[PDB]
Design a protein around this ligand. Structure first.
Ligand SMILES: [Mg+2]
Length: 215
């Protein structure tokens, strides 16, 4: 193996604390704008998100801010509250080990350009040889282009790369469809449907899967 590719959200970090912080502000701003209750604003906002699942726009918070013409920019929220982004304890030792061992490291995310800002703010950016977001290829997982462009940039063949992510449809199916090895990270004890080549609970388990020999 020569390269390990990572999903971001739910895989190497979580933005859930930031989501918990800004959603009430969204409900506040939306209810005040539309002259409706905060509960009705919540219903409308969340319904729109659910309605656009599995689509290009689903992975972009700014899409939803813009759709409701709200005075919010996710980049500004990120820069203001970077401590609300939480890096999993198993992330940095794993990236350190992989980089030191000689693996090329890539990010493949269906989120937009601010995903790179999230990596910068959490101190993870510099571990990666390349970071590919939706906005870099005009495509989302599991479209083959987003995986193929990433490994092309890394200079490796698909069979020389492993994808690690928490989404069965985006990460596992996406990676396998272009000939990569697929590792599903399952932090919350969900159902895996017998799909991935390997299933792990934390990134520390990658050491058992890959072994320790330099590449
Ligand atoms: Mg994810």
């Amino acid at each position: 193996m020569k390269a390990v590719l990572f999903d971001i959200d739910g895989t190497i970090l979580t933005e859930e604390p930031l989501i918990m912080l800004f959603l009430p502000q969204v409900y506040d701003k939306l209810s005040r704008k539309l002259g409706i209750s905060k509960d009705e604003a919540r219903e409308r906002f969340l319904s729109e998100i659910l309605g656009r699942r599995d689509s290009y726009d689903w992975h972009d918070w700014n899409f939803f801010f813009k759709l409701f013409d709200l005075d919010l920019k996710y980049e500004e929220l990120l820069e203001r509250y970077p401590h609300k982004l939480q890096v999993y304890p198993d992330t940095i030792p794993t990236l350190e080990w992989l980089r030191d061992t000689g693996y090329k490291l890539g990010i493949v995310t269906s989120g937009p350009k601010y995903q790179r800002l999230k990596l910068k703010l959490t101190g993870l950016l510099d571990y990666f040889d390349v970071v590919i977001t939706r906005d870099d290829v005009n495509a989302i997982k599991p479209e083959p282009k987003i995986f193929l462009y990433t490994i092309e940039r890394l200079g490796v063949e698909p069979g020389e790369a492993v994808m690690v992510g928490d989404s069965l449809s985006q990460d596992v199916y996406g990676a396998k469809s272009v000939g990569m090895t697929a590792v599903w990270i399952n932090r919350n004890g969900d159902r895996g449907y017998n799909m991935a080549d390997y299933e792990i609970r934390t990134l520390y388990e990658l050491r058992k899967i890959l072994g320790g020999e330099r590449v």
